[PDB]
Ligand binder design. Structure first.
Ligand SMILES: O=C(O)CCc1ccccc1
Ligand SMILES: O=C(O)CCc1ccccc1
Lengths: 396, 396
């Protein structure tokens, strides 16, 4: 049965982990997959997380299956983060949240739900895009088309091209937006631009799907959700696939959420029953530990305070590395001005390095980035900055 | 987009949790979903598990993403449990294991892998069947057909009917077997019958898919794997979807495995790359906590000893409840002899109660079973036995 199966192509992002592990050279620098490193060059467990895990160890008395949609408190805390405490969406019971195994799990659940229960055939994603969107949506039998987004000459959101390319999107198409810290460009709509897009979306009949994996990494928790909230104010229906991987440092525990919004409570409940069916046919019910940690932290004033400060500290360290990166490139004699990198939001810098420069960086220098030119600034430290910048200067 | 969506039908098993929660009557008895309860009528966390969780709390320094196939030690320990230490399958590197979110996740991954990468169109399941098999395989676009299995008059495996119904299975069809503790009948093939089936399977060209969620609950860890090992000795290719939900009491942490076996290392590696692709397009990578607990326990002599005794204790308590159930029914004046229940393996008794008797049990008596007549013996205790048996006698 398996004799003729062809090997799967390496994933542009995920395939980096294997390569890095097989590289026996010391002093290699991992700027590939988007994880937060601290100044010591390690990926720590957050203190608030360890505290929550200790509480769970001391207090859990069962591992009895969660509901298909997960921990109820987790859903409530999620909707507050997404929509704001006292949001009309919450007051009107227009939203239902399934806890999922990561934002990745939420994207698959959304895609399966849409494919099986609606007339959706096409999802629009930005160019450039995060590769897993195409993979996941295609897997569910959905076409993926690209809309213009980034002006690489100005290093800006090409709003004109964006709007013009989305004219090709039909009513009933899905349009995917990143809530903040667009991956990979780090370029987000302004509030006005979000508001313009929200209006356009309503007029054109698009179903908005927000991928919201970086809440807190652009400006802050509430500010980062402005765009999503602009959309929520204008739309009867939307979906959010959100993640706690990055903002809680909980990557491997697979903690995210698929949130479904409809016009009213009756509609969302009916629709959400089919979203639960799509989960039942997949992994049945979500993993408790990571989501319990999130709910524990978000529902305790003291833990929440510690956690929110940890998140601020992460954002601020990345901002320091961003500036030091730009400064060190210039002092190492870079043949390009890289000041545009300061404008970018989140963990990455979309550097303009070619695919061949990225390959040479890895082969010659043991510096690992994504072939798109995306580099993980959250993987930079005072100690590795000089070597990594010397390497970049050498390949320019 | 969501206006016309029809509500999803209630799941025969999973829908019980909601109903039970909405039932405000005290002294209701939950014999529905298959969880292990102790004598106090609660679903405890295993001591070995708590010990492992304390070790993880003290020693984990990162939540960095696992590989797509999960923790390497988890896979190794899994293959040892499935195939035996020093198995030729392990020596010859013919098996690859992906850690998954439950056996349920493993079933979906297997189905997606098969649908996308082979000519499989049909999966054969026993009658009666575990409902999630049809749901999951249908979701992946695979037809599901039933083979005869249980003789309800004799309360036995109708081996003749089994073999005769499977004549309709074509070469290249999948045939699903339960490794032990057939759900719901509790009736398993003898070793000779497994060996006969293994030979027949090879002759007929079926791809065997084992659902192995109850290793240790029939007779013991090694004995329960005899059937699977009989098949492994005879086949070039098979798949195992196994679970640690029940044997570790880790239900809500979603700990299972999809194990792929091919003729040789080259073939399995090539095929497994597409199994990883099917994961990438789903939840990306599996949840660490539950699987780390399993690996920690299985790889430490002292924890393993404690854990294996806990598993024995669970099996033995269920066996005591099985006998007490039969004894109490007879002394409560049951109008049927229920001695056939002693022969059944695992957590359940497939009682012969009609769908209407089950409904009346719930409505009138607050006793919750599955409409198929399946009752969770592992949910019985000395304290709830009298009331539950009085209820059953009343509806006969
Ligand atoms: O590196 C990234 O783009 C974020 C981390 C990640 C990558 C692929 C799947 C899930 C998360
Ligand atoms: O009750 C059962 O049959 C076992 C528990 C279960 C039920 C449905 C999906 C996964 C596990």
């Amino acid at each position: 049965m398996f004799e003729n199966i062809t090997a799967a192509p390496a994933d542009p992002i995920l395939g980096l982990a294997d390569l890095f592990r097989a590289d026996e050279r010391p002093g290699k620098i991992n700027l590939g997959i988007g994880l937060y490193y601290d100044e010591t060059g390690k990926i720590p467990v957050l203190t608030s997380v360890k505290k929550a895990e200790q509480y769970l160890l001391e207090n859990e008395t069962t591992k009895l299956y969660l509901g298909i949609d997960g921990i109820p408190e987790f859903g409530r805390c999620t909707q507050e983060l997404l929509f704001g405490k006292g949001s009309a969406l919450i007051n009107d019971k227009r939203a239902r949240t399934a806890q999922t195994p990561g934002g990745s799990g939420a994207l698959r659940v959304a895609a399966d739900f849409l494919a099986k229960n609606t007339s959706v055939k096409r999802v629009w994603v930005s160019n450039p895009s995060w590769p897993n969107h195409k993979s996941v949506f295609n897997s569910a039998g959905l076409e993926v088309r690209e809309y213009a987004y980034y002006d690489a000459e100005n290093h800006t959101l090409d709003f004109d091209a964006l709007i013009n390319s989305l004219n090709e999107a039909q009513a009933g198409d899905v349009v995917l937006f990143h809530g903040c810290c667009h991956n990979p460009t780090g370029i987000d709509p302004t509030l006005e631009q979000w508001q313009t897009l929200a209006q356009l979306s309503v007029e054109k009949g698009w179903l908005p799907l927000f991928d919201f994996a970086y809440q807190g990494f652009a400006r802050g928790l509430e500010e980062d959700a402005e765009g999503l909230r602009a959309f929520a104010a204008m739309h009867k229906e939307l979906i959010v696939a959100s993640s706690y991987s990055k903002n809680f440092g909980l990557y491997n525990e697979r903690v995210g959420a698929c949130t479904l919004v409809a016009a009213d409570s009756e509609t969302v409940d009916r629709a959400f029953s089919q979203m639960k069916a799509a989960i039942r046919d997949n992994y049945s019910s979500p993993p408790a530990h990571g989501a319990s940690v999130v709910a524990t932290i978000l529902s305790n004033d003291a833990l929440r305070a510690i956690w929110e400060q940890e998140l601020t500290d992460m954002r601020q360290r990345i901002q320091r590395m961003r500036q030091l990166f730009v400064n060190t490139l210039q002092e190492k004699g870079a043949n390009r001005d890289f000041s545009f990198i300061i404008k970018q939001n989140g963990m990455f810098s979309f550097s303009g390095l070619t695919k061949e420069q990225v390959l040479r960086l890895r082969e010659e220098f043991g510096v690992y980035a994504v072939a798109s030119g995306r580099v993980n600034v959250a993987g930079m430290t005072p100690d590795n900055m000089a070597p990594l910048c010397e390497a970049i200067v050498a390949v320019l």
